Amino acid sequence: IETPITANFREGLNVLQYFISTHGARKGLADTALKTANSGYLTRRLVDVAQDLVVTEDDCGTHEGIMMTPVIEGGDVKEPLRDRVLGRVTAEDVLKPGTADILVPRNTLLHEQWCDLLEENSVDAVKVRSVVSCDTDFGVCAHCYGRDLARGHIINKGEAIGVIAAQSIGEPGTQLTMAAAESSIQVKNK
Amino acid sequence: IGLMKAVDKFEYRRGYKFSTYATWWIRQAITRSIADQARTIRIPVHMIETINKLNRISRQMLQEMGREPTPEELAERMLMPEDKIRKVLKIAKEPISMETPIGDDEDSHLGDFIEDTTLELPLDSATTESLRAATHDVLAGLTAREAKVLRMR
Amino acid sequence: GITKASLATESFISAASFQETTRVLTEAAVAGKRDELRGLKENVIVGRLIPAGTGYAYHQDRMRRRAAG
Amino acid sequence: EIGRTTDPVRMYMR
Amino acid sequence: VPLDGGRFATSDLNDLYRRVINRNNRLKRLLDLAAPDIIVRNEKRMLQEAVDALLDNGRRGRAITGSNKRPLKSLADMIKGKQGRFRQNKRVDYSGRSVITVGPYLRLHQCGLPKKMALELFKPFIYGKLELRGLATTIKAAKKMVEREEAVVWDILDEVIREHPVLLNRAPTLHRLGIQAFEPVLIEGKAIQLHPLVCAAYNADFDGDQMAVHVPLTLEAQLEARALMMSTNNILSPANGEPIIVPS
Amino acid sequence: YSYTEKKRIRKDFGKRPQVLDVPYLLSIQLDSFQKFIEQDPEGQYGLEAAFRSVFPIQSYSGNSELQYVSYRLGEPVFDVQECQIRGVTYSAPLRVKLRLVIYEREAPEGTVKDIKEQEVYMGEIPLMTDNGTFVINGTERVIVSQLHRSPGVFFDSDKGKTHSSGKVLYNARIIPYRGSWLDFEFDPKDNLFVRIDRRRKLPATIILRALNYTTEQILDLFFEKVIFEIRDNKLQMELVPERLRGETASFDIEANGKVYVEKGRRITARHIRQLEKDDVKLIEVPVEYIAGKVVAKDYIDESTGELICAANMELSLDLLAKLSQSGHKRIETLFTNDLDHGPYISETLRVDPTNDRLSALVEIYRMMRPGEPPTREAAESLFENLFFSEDRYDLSAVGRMKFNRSLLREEIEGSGILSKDDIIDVMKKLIDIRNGKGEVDDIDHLGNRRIRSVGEMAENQFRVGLVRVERAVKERLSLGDLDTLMPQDMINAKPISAAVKEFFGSSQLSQFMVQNNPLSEITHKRRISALGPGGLTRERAGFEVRDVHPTHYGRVCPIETPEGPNIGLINSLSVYAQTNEYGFLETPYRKVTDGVVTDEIHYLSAIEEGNYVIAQANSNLDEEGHFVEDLVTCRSKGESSLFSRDQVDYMDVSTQQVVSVGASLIPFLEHDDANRALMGANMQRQAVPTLRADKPLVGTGMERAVAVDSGVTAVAKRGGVVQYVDASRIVIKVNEDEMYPGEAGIDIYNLTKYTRSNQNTCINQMPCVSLGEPVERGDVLADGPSTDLGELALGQNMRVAFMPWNGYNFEDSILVSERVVQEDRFTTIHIQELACVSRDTKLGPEEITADIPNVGEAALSKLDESGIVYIGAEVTGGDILVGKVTPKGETQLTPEEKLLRAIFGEKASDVKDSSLRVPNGVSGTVIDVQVFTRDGVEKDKRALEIEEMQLKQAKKDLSEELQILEAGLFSRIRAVLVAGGVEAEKLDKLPRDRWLELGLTDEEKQNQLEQLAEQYDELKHEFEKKLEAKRRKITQGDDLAPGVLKIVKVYLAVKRRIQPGDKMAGRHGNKGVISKINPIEDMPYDENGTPVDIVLNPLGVPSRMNIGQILETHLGMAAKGIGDKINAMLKQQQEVAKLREFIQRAYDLGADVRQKVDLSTFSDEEVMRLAENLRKGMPIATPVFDGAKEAEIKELLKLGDLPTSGQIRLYDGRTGEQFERPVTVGYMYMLKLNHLVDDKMHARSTGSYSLVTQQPLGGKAQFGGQRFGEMEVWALEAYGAAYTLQEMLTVKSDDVNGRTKMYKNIVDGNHQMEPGMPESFNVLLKEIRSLGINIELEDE
Ligand SMILES: [Mg+2]
Ligand SMILES: [Zn+2]
């Protein structure tokens, strides 16, 4: 609207300022009443395709992983490289940028120290083992999945990672419902 | 199946057209079929003549009397023994379907609220299991030959 | 998708449970399937130990018992 | 002439 | 089943089975009476619509119920989703529910539980003590000692609840932290108290939200409610390593 | 100045005067049922217009008429309260006169013979109570209104999604009140299409060809002609100048001498101007240009006689040469310019296969009733029965208005059914929407949604029932014989009375009354539901009709709806709204003259209000109606703006005209977020009426209109003088001038002591006056549930403080002092009911004998020897209330126990015990017992003792009414009869009974003598007959269900206190569950020891933006600051000169306010009584948007010696040190919603089990277990927990013999289970095998 409600909630709002504000409290409630019925069907399907998946082996053996490069948002970073690769195995042991400087060994958990050790050094990407590439039949090995839990250990053999993964993606959404110049390429760096 | 019998027994020499004779054997059937396969808990055919008489006569007393009919005035108007009109009233009601959605039209039906009585309380079964303790122990505290006949009796 | 990939599973109970049911019993009955109960949602229906968690241990002994002593 | 009719009462009279 | 008062409450299948056995019973007759092929050929066409109103009613003229105006409910409309299965996708005994409140004097691993409730969930356990300690001769004589609320049971009920973890769980259980065990402590009132730190896991404001409580019966089921599910094991949410017991 | 005013005058802020008074709040209901049952000798809506919509029923070619004369509503048999006790509806029989005239079979149509059938009785119709609430089965129900689309023509587009390439497809629609639909529309290729209710699509010309229109006339109505002539040179075409609008010409532009344009150039505005100046009518045209047209009409070969060209056939050059010689010159084409004149009807002329009328109906038939083969007289029959048959199509009285109004036609009256002139106009106006010169109509606009009250829904259901009787009277008047039957053998009372009785008894609308307040009932009658029969659905309707259009301003409340699945589909009506004559909602507006604001008030509809320019209620006027501002704020076309002082047309009435009746009582509503002020209007219809409420310390002045407009108060009906107060009766001695002419006497109001509402709360009234009060017309005599002296007190108001106290109010929860439990201010009363019926089994009948098998005498202590409990005996859980035993044989007892009997000889009883015992967890006296017996079974001793006690009361007041009403009959004539003969001291020696022989002079004194006497004899006959009729319905039996022998209903009056778990809440949507009840001394005490009584949390105000509470907590403190400043002055008994000095300074006290409260009041006996009601606190008031500005508050605190900032320093309660940084302390009016704790907490260890599947449920005083639903099993597979999961769905719920072991293992201390397979899976194999499918289990 062209004219904004120009008085706060310490002075009154006359009738025409209140009928204007009364709308947004309707679109507010007609969505939270609907975002529950809608996100209650998105997590009911995720936990019925990912139902039968279970850590069913102690280690697979495959040498094929992925590369975890930090996301780059133009002049800003969306996520640091460390907080993306914490708690994971390492397919090919990265070294210092100088050759033959193998600091992190062959595949090992990247816990709170091996990250910062790779924080002291200057590596720009790591090749970690992902669960989309494990070679096991009917399940995934333990090392391929990784580290995370409510606990801190590696993921125990037998744990049902299928259903605790479809709920972590469905429990949000209930609250996640939904200067523009662009002239000069101006970066903070040199 | 009615009209198939009318033309079976049709006789034309009496001159009466087929319609004014086939109309009897036809309406004969559909009023005999309705009394045979219209109810879940079937009531006999000789009784539906009595139920239908109670509405043909409880409707005629509804206009004259104006107010409504009583359980005894039918006994006066008709000729029943004042109690058969009280047994003919406890019959004609049909069975409520066990999926009729109860009030508020929630996600609930009538079939979710009718408990069952064939079962027994597991404290009623936990006693009879316990009772065999005493009658096997108390009755074991008898003599031998005098307890066997007590158990065989 | 997640809606068409949960239909084409090997079982016919983990599909008939949540998806369209009239079409998953028809197609399974014609072919004569044999659901081997190697899952969770097909294994809580029958009412026994789900094969992941505290119940996964005892399933180590059940597959180690058939095809042998 | 069979205009996708289903119920028999349509098919009886016809 | 006969309702109370004379009416019966039939299932909606005895309305459909009577409609096949009746039509099939007539078609047995027309082949003995030898009707023309305009009728018997109309019979099979009428039977076959009644067998297919039994299997999956609705893919036809929708043979609505008699004596009422809603459609009947055939066999294939019984497995068909109510949003989920007919079997287990199970209402449950040993349960309850009440209005939660605050109670900020509790430790992290215990929740209140009213005397009037705990005396009703743990009934079969209490019957064990009153017949083990010899206080009741037989079980029928123990059922009348718990109904009087004699002053002895209030001290036997406290030993039944020594280390018996119960399971509090709120209604729209989104994630695995929505179910957590607790070691009860008997209070007086009718509100299930609850440690304030955990109320951000259930997402529970204290303005009328209720919470069921269950009871793990067997001996392996009150260790799984103490090793795996206890409330002091879950201080890291599974979606990410960030804590879940932040003072709110 | 009313005598209720001078008992307590509420101080009133607010500046704008009030011009319109709040109307009678129940006109929505009480008025639109008066239209229904009332003699209307004309054709308006009403019952009389329902018969004329059917009668007279002309016979089926027999011509023996049946015609309607008049009806008449008899009186009910029972009155209201007898209809609520006895348990049967409150109706009124209906009588109709019908004349049956039998014409002559062959002779002239003369008055042959007839019989005036003496009022064939055709059903009962329920009657509305005094307040607007029906009584269906001893339960007052309420019929909400409905908000549905009005019948008319609604053009609409549905842009965007269609075809994924734009292509707005503007369609029409025609919705009648009764009959099929009709739905034109476009397609993605600009071809009109017609549709029915929803059948397959048809080319839209296929209906025009059915109306007997040929391809020529179809193209004559739609297009314009372009005449062509051939005057032996180059085919000169006529031309008007305007015909060249926006054209791209491409010929040799010649006209009237001058070549204006050139080939490949567009036409100018001055190009046209060269045409009128030149008078350009005929031009030269090329010979190839005519190959891009279509023939106007048919040109046949006049030379030969073979059709050369038919309409809608574009031109071929040979056809020109075929035409250049054919002997024709009056050629014609179609004016079709693609910019504004599209040939939309042309193309559908080609896709239409049918080209003659009879072969179009055969196409309409073939798609309206598929399968069957067509005919001739059938297809003609169906089409003229669909729309133009007055019985099966009735647009409306209103539908014609919205129809003519939408086509810009003249009048508003018209035939109810369509015509050929209407289907054409809609197609044109639909086409004009496509070409640009029209606008569509959004469905949400409140000028397209009418309101159906009760009187318009019952009749519409009645007339549907009336037709059903017409179906049988014909076949009995045509198939049956007409020899001697009367007009009482064909009419049926069961079908007609069933068509309506099912309406009030079951519907989406005819719902129970939410009756736990004087405000939750009065806001349930003004609901405007959009659901119901013939309306929306909670899952179909999207966000489009859940939002708030800018037309709701003044008609429907924006800030009061539910919050569940139907937010925005309930829409409680507004405060000043009133429906139109047709049904559309309207609102008052002060007519604004040239300069001055008048007061003649107009009600504007929803489509009229969008024209004028309307000011706002808050615009100052200089005591003459002139704005003091040259510019004002207005809203003109649905938008806000500024305008000139002399440019507005209307100004709104007042400031509280936008809001509902619910949200009009929140004080400081303007300071609240619309979110949390929406939870305010839903926590005042749930507040329970406490023991004896007091008042709102900070009201909003719109309370007296909610406790008088509802029926809870016993408002005085004629002014006078109270003569006998009592806890259950008031006797108002009427005044003189308000007294009837002859035989008037006095009035009397009965009260209604402790009775049971619909939620089991109590509703009892109390007197508030004493002996000698001058009552007046409209005064108040009896408070009700939550009213006080007329005001509407919903709850108590208690000293509240905002501070976090030790974590005992962590979340929204609340703390509570123990001084709020001792004083018993939140203790409410509840009144249950228990019923014990003794059916008539087939094994013998049950008994209500007071002997019960093997029951200890401790249980049979309360109930007397007759079997029923006493009256007043305080019972508790598990006690006995009605001894009842049922006959039981067929023992066959077990073998082991069969030894147990022989050992002790315990006689097995013939009868099983099934008495009624009080439900667990309840305790309260038994305040009332009633007994119903089937007429034909003897009354026991207790059944008579009950009956006689009301037999002595029924005749007591019915006769004692004379003994008190005789008191005034003589005393009125004694004050009159003293003349006309001197008899004043002889008037008592002359017997007051024996005055029929003598009398007085011929005046009203004597006119009253035989006046009183003839009804004196008739009050010997009429009162005595009122005794027999009263003493008749007492003794007789009852009308029970079939089989039932005798019922027994028992009441309990339990009195529940407050406790942890309850749910208190203020007015501003700040809920909270009481967390603890402290002692008296832990609560923070201020400087003078007065502890606070609640401790709210201050972390609720920053996020939830309700700053109402923090302002009501201060103005609630200034008001109670005057309370302790007067209570001290009145306690030293200073003088009535000091009070009138203070109380007068406490009333001016503002800034340009409109009170004028004081100084006309009595000398000392009224001020000391006004000041004696203000000692608890002077009730401030605050209108909704004319609030109390902050400076006006602070100036009231400074008069009370309180600190201006509103924050004191509280000392801790336990330690004794002082909280640094002072705390707030005020007086917040606190409700107490009825989500009590001891109705929420269930628990179950073992109980009933369902029937088909063996899981648990609650029908045996042990409700089901919880719902371990599908969402909660994924939270037990997330953990590895798989032993908890197995027993939670095998042993604890569903297995049959795996759980009877798990109950015997538990009692022995062996916690171990044997699962087995659930019984809810074995039913899933029997339910699959019962199809063709075969299902089994392998073996290994
Ligand atoms: Mg909550
Ligand atoms: Zn692997």
Cα gap E53→E74, rounded to integer Å: 7
Q: Are F1188 and F13 in contact (CB under 8 A)?
A: yes
Question: What is the resolution in angstroms?
Answer: 3.7
Residue of chain C with shortest Cα separation from E56:
C22
What is the dihedral sign for C-alpha F625, F627, F632, F633? negative
Q: Name every chain B residue with its beta carbon within 8 A of the beta carbon of E3.
A: 96, 114
Chains D and F touch (3+ CB pairs under 8 A): yes
* E144: three-class secondary structure by DSSP: helix
CA distances from C11 to B37, C38, E171 (A): 45, 9, 31
Q: Name every chain A residue with its beta carbon within 8 A of the beta carbon of E238.
A: 148-150, 164, 168
Q: F828-946+1045-1056 has which CATH code?
A: 2.40.50.150
Q: How far is F145 from chain E (nearest CA, A)?
A: 25
Residue of chain C with shortest Cα separation from F1336:
C34
Residue whose C-alpha is closest to residue C40's, from A163, F275, E167: A163
Ligand minimally distant from the alpha carbon of residue A135: 2
Neighbours of F451 (CB within 10 A): 24
Q: Where are the beta strands (DSSP E) in F318-438?
A: 331-335
For tokens 């967390």, name the residue: F1075
Cα gap F969→F986, rounded to integer Å: 18
Q: Are F1268 and E91 in contact (CB under 8 A)?
A: yes
Chains C and F touch (3+ CB pairs under 8 A): yes
- Using CB atoms, which residue from E4, E79, E97 is nearest to F1327? E79
Cα gap D7→C66, rounded to integer Å: 56
Q: Name every chain F residue with its beta carbon within 8 A of the beta carbon of B122.
A: 1246, 1299-1300, 1303-1304
Residue F876 contacts E where some CB pair is shorter than 8 Å: no
- Using CB atoms, which residue from F633, F670, F1280 is nearest to A13? F670
State whether E68 and B93 contact (CB < 8 Å).
Answer: no
CA triple B20-B22-B27, angle to 5 deg: 105
Quickly list H helices, F443-554: 455-478, 493-505
Burial of F409 (0-12, 13-18, 19+ CB in 10 A): middle
CA of A156 to the centre of ligand 2 (A): 14
Residue whose C-alpha is closest to residue F1284's, from E214, E126, E184, A159: E214
Burial of F307 (0-12, 13-18, 19+ CB in 10 A): exposed
Q: How far is C5 from chain F (nearest CA, A)?
A: 20
Cα gap F589→F599, rounded to integer Å: 9
Q: Name every chain C residue with its beta carbon within 8 A of the beta carbon of E224.
A: 54
Pick among F531, F1040, F1250, F1260 to test the B interface (most B CBs inside 10 A):
F1250
Largest CA distance in chain A: 75
3-state secondary structure E83-94: CCCCCCCCEECC
As a residue count, chain D comes to 14
Ligand minimally distant from the alpha carbon of residue E209: 1
Q: Name every chain A residue with its beta carbon within 8 A of the beta carbon of E240.
A: 148
Residue of chain B with shortest Cα separation from E32:
B1
Give the number of beta-carbon pairs within 8 Å between A and F: 88
Ligand minimally distant from the alpha carbon of residue F679: 1
Residue E85 contacts C where some CB pair is shorter than 8 Å: yes
- Using CB atoms, which residue from F546, F633, F1187 is nearest to A30? F546
Q: Name every chain E residue with its beta carbon within 8 A of the beta carbon of B95.
A: 7-10
Neighbours of E120 (CB within 10 A): 20
Pick among B98, B119, B130 to test the E interface (most E CBs inside 10 A):
B98
Pick among E44, E46, E47, E48 to test the D interface (most D CBs inside 10 A):
E46
Cα gap E55→A13, rounded to integer Å: 63
Neighbours of E239 (CB within 10 A): 19
Give the number of beta-carbon pairs within 8 Å between E and F: 251
Which pair of tokens denotes residue F998?
């003598």
State whether A16 and F548 contact (CB < 8 Å).
Answer: no
| Domain at B38-118, CATH from 1.10.10.10, 3.40.47.10, 1.20.210.10, 2.40.50.140 | 1.10.10.10
Q: Name every chain E residue with its beta carbon within 8 A of the beta carbon of A149.
A: 236, 238
State whether E147 and F1289 contact (CB < 8 Å).
Answer: no
Q: Name every chain E residue with its beta carbon within 8 A of the beta carbon of C14.
A: none
Neighbours of F565 (CB within 10 A): 11
* E101: three-class secondary structure by DSSP: coil
Pick among F1283, F1289, F1291 to test the C interface (most C CBs inside 10 A):
F1283
CA of F447 to the centre of ligand 1 (A): 39
- Using CB atoms, which residue from A87, A152, A168 is nearest to E239? A168
Cα gap F738→F719, rounded to integer Å: 7
Which pair of tokens denotes residue F1079?
């002692």
Residue of chain D with shortest Cα separation from E43:
D8
Chains C and A touch (3+ CB pairs under 8 A): yes
State whether A151 and E236 contact (CB < 8 Å).
Answer: yes
Q: Where are the beta strands (DSSP E) in F830-871?
A: 830-835
DSSP code per residue over F644-711: EGGG--EE-S-STTSSBSSTTSSTTGGGS-TTTTTTTTTSSSSB---SS----TB--S-STTTSSSSS
* F473: three-class secondary structure by DSSP: helix
Chains F and B touch (3+ CB pairs under 8 A): yes
- Using CB atoms, which residue from B112, B125, B131 is nearest to F896? B131
State whether B63 and F1300 contact (CB < 8 Å).
Answer: no
Cα gap F77→F501, rounded to integer Å: 17
Residue A74 contacts F where some CB pair is shorter than 8 Å: no
Neighbours of C (≥3 Cβ pairs closer than 8 A)? A, E, F
Q: To which H or E segment does residue F97 belong?
A: strand F93-102
Q: To which H or E segment does residue E185 belong?
A: strand E179-187
Q: Are F934 and F1047 in contact (CB under 8 A)?
A: no
Chains A and E touch (3+ CB pairs under 8 A): yes
Ligand minimally distant from the alpha carbon of residue A57: 2
Q: What is the DSSP letter of B110?
A: G
- Using CB atoms, which residue from C25, C45, C55 is nearest to F1282? C55
Cα gap F930→F133, rounded to integer Å: 25
Q: Name every chain E residue with its beta carbon within 8 A of the beta carbon of C20.
A: 81
State whether E61 and D12 contact (CB < 8 Å).
Answer: no
DSSP code per residue over A12-58: ---HHHHHHHHHHHHHTHHHHHHHHHHHHHHHHHHHHHSTT--B--S
Residue of chain B with shortest Cα separation from F1306:
B126
Q: To which H or E segment does residue F363 belong?
A: helix F358-368
Instruction: Judge if the upstream peptide bond of residue F370 is cis by omega within 30 degrees of 0.
Output: no
Residue F631 contacts A where some CB pair is shorter than 8 Å: no
What is the dihedral sign for C-alpha B34, B36, B37, B42? positive
- Using CB atoms, which residue from E14, E30, E138 is nearest to B40? E14
Cα gap F826→F1059, rounded to integer Å: 10
State whether A26 and F658 contact (CB < 8 Å).
Answer: no
Neighbours of E (≥3 Cβ pairs closer than 8 A)? A, B, C, D, F
Cα gap F170→F187, rounded to integer Å: 9
Experimental technique for the deposited model: cryo-EM
